[PDB]
């Protein structure tokens, strides 16, 4: 098996700025009848890989000219002249010269867009869920950048720990932002013992922390 | 045009065998090779094998040993990959791709197929509304306690697509998945318009529609 | 249509660059009842390095053969002539490149 | 011995690394009267450089086929079953090295 | 043991075709390839072509164009080379050789076959004695005015072989070849012993024996 | 077609002295499956080539160890550690890697043995030949070295020119000498007009010239 090594493993690039990805194979990718089967793919999370460059330097139909390929033997480079938001994803090199066909580790491309403060929302548990004997409080941090955000749950001013999970979206292909959801999980009993449920957010885009709350017994 | 459609996601117990299908259209099935490639969660792509639908001639990756069987049916333009003696490590997204000698690689790809290797029981989700308790509002659906992945969350039967965020699922201490799909909407629309989330869990044959009301 | 018929009845598969295995095709209503057919071992061919080369193809070489089939069915004394395609071995070919 | 018989009657040769040409084998006393047989174009095979490689061999792949022969001779209504060897194509093999 | 015997020398007119045979023995004919190599007078060796006696598969030298045809007969263990549209330049010694994959070259060779391309008439030789007119004597035979080459000169039917010199033929202004075979002998033997040269010109079917007397 | 070039084209070696022959091919003689099909042959005049070395360095069964082969890619050498009389002939290199198979020009090996003076003999024309109307007088120079010898024909003391031919044997495989024959051709009429026929020989091995003669009208 041919080993394909990609450098770097991750990249954060400002839109408009160039990007370069290296691919080196453990053995030469030149075939007996003269062709070099080195290709470049871009994969967006939870989507099939899309062909970018085939046979070292050929751009696939529909691929913008900002993408270019070069190299020979064992060392290859994919260059992006100007990074655009739509370019977010994981880039793979691949050899189809030698069986079994092999891919590189992948290089993650993150778009270094400008700070975007999150819009914060809070959702009380539904009456149907409460019948179930559990309460889930949800806090949404919408369309922000960078990914680093801090969510704190307060129940009647007391800081909570170990009873909440987070989930972040994949960086958006159009606006290059993220969205996060924090879910506080309480028993129906604990939930009904307290009044104020607050969600506190800290982010680079905010001048001070943002709190969204409700009083159990409005809803 | 050229299109590859794979079979829906599956949950298989350790030691069992899975068979993923790949239906081809938009070209002469027999004239192009079909390759199979997999991807374990947050991992790279891995080539599994190839079939020549014209003759049934195949070539496999030795790493999988004699566990992979790839076959093609000329009459239904469908190729299949059969992975036997399933391990937890075989939990992955399985892709089919048609290769060619001009490009020398896989141009056209199937959508993917998620195969969860688990001794865990299949459970359909519970869909709860997320309504608030100033001029932009958010509403959503808590899709809680289902196994295995994936779920599909649309809004107003696919009408509403702008401003929707269906969060990556998080495996709770239950062993069950939980997730939320949210949408931002003008506060003015809260009354004049109706917002419904459509949840589909194909493994448990569960289709649920919940009306989000404040 | 009817005539009187009197009855008067190499490691290549391994050494080929397009090797093959023989498969048993048995039909009790047919003469010969058993036909051994070649199935190509790989998609590709074996190169000078002894590895499978994906950019060459192992293809089966097929030929029309004459077989007797019982007519009407299960009649041991009455037959019909039939022409079937059988794979006798495999060859190595450079592939066809398709474009429009 | 006698049965009733009802009558019910790819550029590989060029693209192969062991190419061949078809030769006309005609016998008016036989059915099929005409059999097209493969004869290997070279001793060797064609390598990646498109040249003939002497250290590989183009060998004909042969199979037993059923043919009808007029019995007694020149009788259009009476036949005998015969088994003959025909070359259907050629394959490329690594040679056998001989020693004692 | 392993042996290759070729057909006798020939004279062919320009434009005609020659067929040289190569009879094999001491091994399984079908298991080894037969190559043909030629040599024009005082020139290097030149590979003409090859046959696989098992299948009749051949490969030729493009220099000769479609003029060379090599064939083999399994039943008589004989290979043949047929060179058509003969030129003066085709005057040469033609060899057959069996090749093998262990050695990778031609081990066993035929004796050779001389083919003279000439519009000149075949003529048998005239054998004249060479006798003298102190203790070692020389005697010989003048083999004069024959066409084409070669002749075989033995002494006392192959008995006498030591001290014999059969000189390379010299093409006289006639267009005919001339040559002498000589032998040194003790002067004491001149009386007690009889010396006869045996001349054989196979192309003209001429066998001559001349008694050398002084 | 692969071109095989041999250096030197000829060689004169003293028995016991070493010899070396170079062979260079226009392209590398290394085959795709790893073997190098370069071979050495020795050809004695009017005999088939004899195999000496196969596959660069392997000696053929029966070939003495004085013969050795070496080289790689395009440059090869045949070495003879001690030249022996039996080694006389033409040496050829040959490639059987690429079709069409090719041979070198050939290198002639002459054995530089010590001087050997010739034994000189003269033969009058036969009575049968004379009936034919032609007279051929033969002079034999036996077992001499080197090849350079001078034969002069005198008819009644008058030096002859343009009415005689020579023929030299191939260097002997055992004693490394040559033998020459000079034939004087006269008409029956010219022959019968003169008495003394002499053959005069000059050679490195002779301290002075050697004459062999006869008087027409003894024989």
Q: CA gyration radius for chain C?
A: 19
CA-closest candidate to residue D15, choices D53, D57, D37, D45 = D45
| Token code pair at residue A164 | 């909440």
Give start-end residues of each CATH 2.60.40.10 domain in chain A. 1-112, 113-216
Nearest to E59 among D42, D95, D99 (CB): D42
3-state secondary structure of E26: coil
Half-sphere CA count of F42, side-chain side, radius 13 A: 19
Whether B72 contacts B82, CB under 8 Å:
no
Say how far residue A130 (Cα) sits from the centre of its chain.
33
C-alpha C64 chain-centroid distance: 9
Q: Do B32 and C98 touch (CB under 8 A)?
A: yes
- Non-local (6+) Cβ contacts of B61 within 8 A are A100, B46, B47, B48, B49, B68
Query: B168 vs A104: CB contact, 8 Å cut-off?
Result: no
Distance from CA of A22 to the nearest CA of C (A): 26
Report the run of H or E that residue B190 belongs to, with start and end. helix B189-192
Question: Could you give the CA distance from residue C32 to residue F218 in angstroms, rounded to a whole number?
Answer: 95
Interface test with C, best of D11, D13, D15, D44 (most C CBs within 10 A): D15
Backbone angles phi, psi at C47, to 5 degrees: -90, 180
User: B211 contacts in A (CB within 8 Å)?
Assistant: none
Q: Using an 8 Å Cβ cutoff, are D58 and D90 in contact? A: yes
Nearest CA-CA partner of C55 in C16, C96, C94, C98: C94
The residue of chain C with its CA nearest to that of A33 is C55
What count of other Cβ atoms lies within 10 Å of the Cβ of residue F63?
17
> How far is the first Cα of chain B from the last one, in angstroms, to the nearest whole number?
45
Which of F4, F101, F165 is most worth mutating to test chain E (most E CB atoms within 10 A of its CB)?
F101
Q: Residues near F159 by Cβ (< 8 Å), separated by ≥ 6?
A: F152, F153
Q: Which helix (H) or strand (E) holds B81?
A: strand B78-83
Does residue D33 contact residue D65 with C-beta atoms inside 8 Å?
no
Tokens 């070939």 sit at which residue?
Answer: F63
Among F48, A100, B75, residue whose Cα is nearest residue C44: A100
Give the burial class of C10: count Cβ atoms within 10 A of its Cβ; 0-12 exposed, 13-18 middle, 19 or more buried.
exposed
CB contact under 8 A, C42 and B59: yes
Q: Evaluate the omega torsion of the peptide bond into residue D7 and state whether it is cis, within 30 degrees of 0.
A: no
Domain of C36, in residue numbers: 12-93
A160: number of Cβ within 10 Å: 15
- β partners of residue D81: D68
**Domain-located, residue D1:** no
**CA-to-CA distance for B113 and B38, rounded, in angstroms?**
9
The reply to whether residue F126 touches residue E129, judged by beta carbons under 8 angstroms, is: yes
- E137, E195 Cβ separation under 8 angstroms: no
Q: Which residues of C touch A1 (CB under 8 A)?
A: none
Q: How far apart are CA F166 and CA F182, in angstroms?
A: 5
Instruction: For residues A120 and E188, give the distance between their C-alpha atoms in angstroms, rounded to a whole number.
Output: 136
Lookup: tokens for B34: 């079909």
Q: Which residues of C touch B102 (CB under 8 A)?
A: 97-99
User: Do F42 and F89 touch, CB atoms closer than 8 A?
Assistant: yes
Q: Does F167 touch chain D (CB under 8 A)?
A: no
Question: Given a contact as 3+ CB pairs under 8 Å, which chains touch C?
Answer: A, B, D
Q: Is D36 domain-assigned?
A: yes
Residues 6+ apart with CB under 8 A from E167: E179, E180, E181, E182, F167, F168, F169, F179, F181
CA nearest to B91, candidates B163, B43, B56, B136: B43
Chain B residue with minimum CA distance to C96: B101
Q: Quick check: B164 contacting A, CB < 8 Å?
A: no
Q: Do D55 and F31 touch (CB under 8 A)?
A: yes
**At B191, which helix (H) or strand (E)?**
helix B189-192
Task: Considering only the beta carbons, identify the residue of C6, C81, C92 that sits closest to D9.
Answer: C81
Pairwise CA distance, residues F92 & F50, whole Å = 10
Yes or no: say if F176 and F145 are a contact pair by the CB < 8 Å rule.
Answer: yes
- List, comma-separated, the residues after which chain C is broken, a break being a C to N distance over 2.5 A; otherwise answer none: 9
- Nearest residue of A to residue B48, measured between CA atoms: A100
By C-alpha distance, the chain B residue nearest A6 is B44
Contact indicator for A136, A183 with CB cutoff of 8 Å: yes
Write the CA distances from C78 to C82, C84, D70, D71, integer angstroms. Answer: 13, 19, 20, 20
Cβ-based neighbours of A30, under 8 Å, separated by 6 or more: A36, A72, A73, A97
Q: Distance from CA of residue E152 to its chain's centroid? A: 9
Q: Could E128 and F106 be called an inter-chain contact, meaning their C-beta atoms sit closer than 8 Å?
A: no
Q: Which of E97, E105, E170 sits opposite F165 (nearest CB)?
A: E170
Interface of E with F in 107-136 (CB under 8 A): 107, 109-112, 126, 128-133, 136
Cis peptide before E101 (omega within 30 of 0): no
Q: Which of A32, A34, A35 should be substituted to probe chain C, the one whose Cβ sees the most C Cβ atoms within 10 Å?
A: A32
Q: Do chains F and D touch (3 or more CB pairs under 8 A)?
A: yes
Q: How far is CA C10 from CA C46, D31, E101, in A?
A: 19, 29, 18
Tokens of B14: 């350790």
CB contact under 8 A, F99 and D54: yes
F34 contacts C49 by C-beta, under 8 angstroms: no
Instruction: Give the Cα-Cα-Cα angle F5, F8, F11 (nearest 5 degrees).
Output: 145
Q: Residue C44 and residue A31: Cβ atoms within 8 Å?
A: no
C19 touching A (Cβ < 8 Å): no
Instruction: Give me the residues paired with residue D21 across strands.
Output: D39
Quote the CA–CA distance of A61 and A98 in Å, as a whole number. Answer: 25
8 A C-beta contact, residue A97 and residue A103 = no
Q: What distance lies between CA B207 and its chain's CA centroid?
A: 16
Which DSSP string corresponds to B8-69? PPEEE-TT--EEEEEEEESS-GGGS-EEEEEE-TT---EEEEEEETTTTEEEE-GGG-TTEE
If one looks up domain E126-212 in CATH, what number appears? 2.60.40.10
When scoring F2, F10, F48, F76 by the number of chain E Cβ atoms within 10 A, the one with the most, hence best to mutate, is F48
Domain boundaries, chain B: 3-117, 126-212
Please check whether residue D16 is in contact with residue D89, taking contact to mean a CB–CB distance below 8 angstroms: yes
Tally Cβ neighbours within 10 Å of residue D26: 10
Distances (CA, A) of E24 to C1, E4, E36: 52, 5, 14
Burial string for E194-212 (b: 16+ CB within 10 Å, else e) reads ebbbbbbbebeebebebeb
Residue D98, domain member (yes or no): no
Task: Read off φ and ψ for residue E107, nearest 5 degrees.
Answer: -85, -65
Helix (H, G, I), strand (E, B) or coil at B3: strand
Q: Which tokens belong to F81?
A: 């550690």
Q: Which of F100, F65, F83 is nearest to F171 (CA)?
A: F83
Shortest CA distance to E177 belongs to which of E154, E147, E150? E147
The answer to whether A135 touches A188, Cβ cutoff 8 Å, is: yes
CATH of F113-216, one of 3.40.50.1980, 2.40.50.140, 3.10.129.10, 2.60.40.10: 2.60.40.10
Q: Label the pairing between strands C30-31 and C57-70.
A: antiparallel
Show which of residues 53-82 on chain C sit within 8 Å of chain A, judged by CB atoms.
53-55
The long-range contacts involving F185-194, CB below 8 angstroms and separated by at least 24 positions, are F185/F134, F185/F135, F185/F136, F186/F134, F186/F135, F186/F136, F186/F137, F186/F155, F187/F133, F187/F134, F187/F135, F188/F130, F188/F132, F188/F133, F188/F134, F188/F135, F190/F135, F191/F125, F191/F130, F191/F135, F191/F216, F192/F216, F194/F155, F194/F156
Query: Which residues lie closer than 8 Å to F161 by C-beta, 6 or more apart?
Result: none
What does this entry list as its resolution, in Å?
A: 2.9
Report the chain D residue with the minimal C-alpha distance to residue E61: D52
Backbone angles phi, psi at A178, to 5 degrees: -125, 160
Count: domains in chain C: 1
C-beta atoms of B59 and C54 within 8 A: yes
Residue E66 CB coordination number (10 Å): 9
Q: Kindly report the CATH number assigned to the domain that includes residue C40.
A: 2.10.90.10
| Cβ of residue B165 closer than 8 Å to a chain A Cβ | yes
Give the tokens for residue E8: 């006798």
Q: 3-state SS of chain A?
A: CCCEEEECCEEEECCCCCEEEEEEECCCCECCCCCECEEEEEECCCCCCEEEEECCCEECCCCCCCEEEEEECCEEEEEECCCCHHHCEEEEEEECCCCCCEECCCEEEEECCCCECCEEEEECCCHHHHHCCEEEEEEEEEEEECCCEEEEEEECCEECCCCEEEEECCCCCCCCCEEEEEEEEEEHHHHHHCCEEEEEEEECCCCCCEEEEEECCCC
Which residues of chain B approach chain C closer than 8 Å at the C-beta?
31-33, 50-52, 55-59, 100-102
Inspect the structure and tell me whether chains B and A have 3 or more CB pairs less than 8 Å apart.
yes
Q: Is B41 exposed, middle or buried (0-12, 13-18, 19+ CB in 10 A)?
A: exposed
User: In terms of CA atoms, which chain D residue is nearest residue E101?
Assistant: D97
Tokens of A147: 């990914």
Question: What is the C-alpha separation between C33 and C38, in angstroms, rounded?
Answer: 16
- Contact between residue F82 and residue F16 where contact means Cβ atoms under 8 Å apart: yes
Distance between CA atoms of residues F200 and E55, nearest Å: 63
Kindly determine whether residue C81 and residue D8, on different chains, have CB atoms separated by under 8 Å. Answer: yes
Within 8 A by CB and 6+ apart from D55, the residues are D44, D95, E101, F31, F32, F33, F35
Three-point CA angle A190, A195, A199, nearest 5°: 90
What count of residues does chain D have?
100
Using CB atoms, which residue from D59, D65, D81 is nearest to C6? D81
Residue E62, SS3? helix
Which among F104, F136, F169 is the nearest to E167, CB-wise? F169
Cβ neighbours of E49 in D, within 8 Å: none
Alpha carbon A77 to chain centroid, angstroms: 23
Q: Give the 3-state DSSP-derived string for chain F, with helices as H, strands as E and coil as C.
A: CCCEEEECCEEEECCCCCEEEEEEECCCCECCCCCECEEEEEECCCCCCEEEEECCCEECCCCCCCEEEEEECCEEEEEECCCCHHHCEEEEEEECCCCCCEECCCEEEEECCCCECCEEEEECCCHHHHHCCEEEEEEEEEEEECCCEEEEEEECCEECCCCEEEEECCCCCCCCCEEEEEEEEEEHHHHHHCCEEEEEEEECCCCCCEEEEEECCCC
DSSP line for chain C: ---EEE-----HHHHBSS-EEEEEEE-TTEESSEEEEEEES-SSEE-TTSSEETTSEEEEEEEEEEEEEESSTT-TTEEEEEEEEEEEEEEEEPPPPP--
SS3 assignment, position E110: coil
Options 2.40.10.10, 3.40.50.2020, 2.60.40.10, 3.40.50.2000; CATH of B3-117:
2.60.40.10
Beta bridge partners of A205: none
Query: What SS3 class is residue E148?
Result: coil
Which CATH architecture best describes the domain F1-112?
A: Sandwich (2.60)
DSSP code, position B175: S
> Solved how?
X-ray
**Given CB atoms, is D17 within the 8 Å cutoff of chain F?**
no
Element (H, E) at E108: strand E108-109
Which SS3 state, helix, strand or coil, does residue B7 take? coil
Residue E188's SS3 state is coil
Q: Output Rg (C-alpha) for chain A, integer angstroms.
A: 24
SS3 label, residue E192: helix
Q: Which of F16, F29, F59 is nearest to F41 (CA)?
A: F59
Best of F98, F100, F101, F102 to mutate (most D CBs within 10 Å, chain D): F98
Rg of chain B taking only CA atoms, in angstroms: 21
């Amino acid at each position: 098996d041919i080993v394909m090594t990609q450098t770097p493993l991750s990249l954060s690039v400002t839109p408009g700025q160039p990007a370069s990805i290296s691919c080196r194979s453990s053995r030469s990718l030149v075939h007996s009848r003269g062709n070099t089967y080195l290709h470049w793919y871009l994969q967006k999370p939870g989507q099939s890989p899309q062909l970018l460059i085939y046979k070292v330097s050929n751009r696939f139909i529909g691929v913008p000219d900002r993408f270019s390929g070069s190299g020979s033997g064992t060392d290859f480079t994919l260059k992006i002249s100007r990074v655009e938001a739509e370019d977010v994803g994981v880039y793979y090199c691949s050899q189809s010269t030698h069986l079994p066909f092999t891919f590189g580790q992948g290089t993650k491309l993150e778009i270094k867009r400008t700070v975007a403060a999150p819009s914060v929302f809070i959702f009380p548990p539904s009456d149907e869920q409460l019948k179930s004997g559990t309460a889930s409080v949800v806090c949404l941090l919408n369309n922000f950048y960078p990914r680093e955000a801090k969510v704190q749950w307060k129940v009647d001013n007391a800081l909570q720990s170990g009873n909440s999970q987070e989930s972040v979206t994949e960086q958006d292909s159009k606006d290059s932002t993220y969205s996060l959801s924090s879910t506080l999980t309480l028993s129906k009993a604990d939930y009904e013992k307290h009044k104020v449920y607050a969600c506190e957010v800290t982010h680079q885009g905010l001048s001070s922390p943002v709190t969204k709350s409700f009083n159990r017994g409005e809803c | 045009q050229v299109q590859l459609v794979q079979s829906g996601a599956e949950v298989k117990k350790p030691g069992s065998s899975v068979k993923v299908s790949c239906k081809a259209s938009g070209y002469s099935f027999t004239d192009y090779h079909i390759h199979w490639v997999r991807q374990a969660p947050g991992q790279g792509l891995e080539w599994m094998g190839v079939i020549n639908p014209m003759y049934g001639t195949t070539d496999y990756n030795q790493r999988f040993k004699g566990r992979v069987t790839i076959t093609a049916d000329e009459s239904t333009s469908t190729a299949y990959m059969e992975l036997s003696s399933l391990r937890s490590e075989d939990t992955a997204v399985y892709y089919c791709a048609r290769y060619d000698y001009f490009t020398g690689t896989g141009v056209y790809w199937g959508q993917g197929t998620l195969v969860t290797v688990s001794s865990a029981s299949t459970k359909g989700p519970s869909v709860f509304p997320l309504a608030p308790c100033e001029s932009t509002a958010a509403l959503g659906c808590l899709v809680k306690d289902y196994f295995p992945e994936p779920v599909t969350v649309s809004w107003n039967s696919g009408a509403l697509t702008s401003g929707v965020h269906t969060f990556p699922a998080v495996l709770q201490s239950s062993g069950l998945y939980s997730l939320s799909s949210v949408v931002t909407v003008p506060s003015s629309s809260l009354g004049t318009k109706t917002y419904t989330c459509n949840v589909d869990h194909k493994p448990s044959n569960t289709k649920v529609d919940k009306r989000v009301e404040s | 249509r009817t005539v009187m018929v009197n009855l008067n009845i190499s490691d290549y598969y391994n050494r080929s660059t397009s090797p093959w295995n023989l498969h048993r095709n048995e039909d009790p209503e047919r003469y010969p009842s058993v036909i051994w057919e070649a199935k190509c071992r790989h998609l590709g061919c074996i190169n000078a390095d002894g590895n499978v080369d994906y950019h060459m193809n192992s293809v089966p070489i097929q030929q029309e053969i004459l077989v007797l089939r019982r007519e009407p069915p299960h009649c041991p004394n009455s037959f019909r002539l039939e022409k079937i395609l059988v794979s006798v071995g495999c060859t190595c070919v450079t592939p066809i490149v398709h474009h429009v």
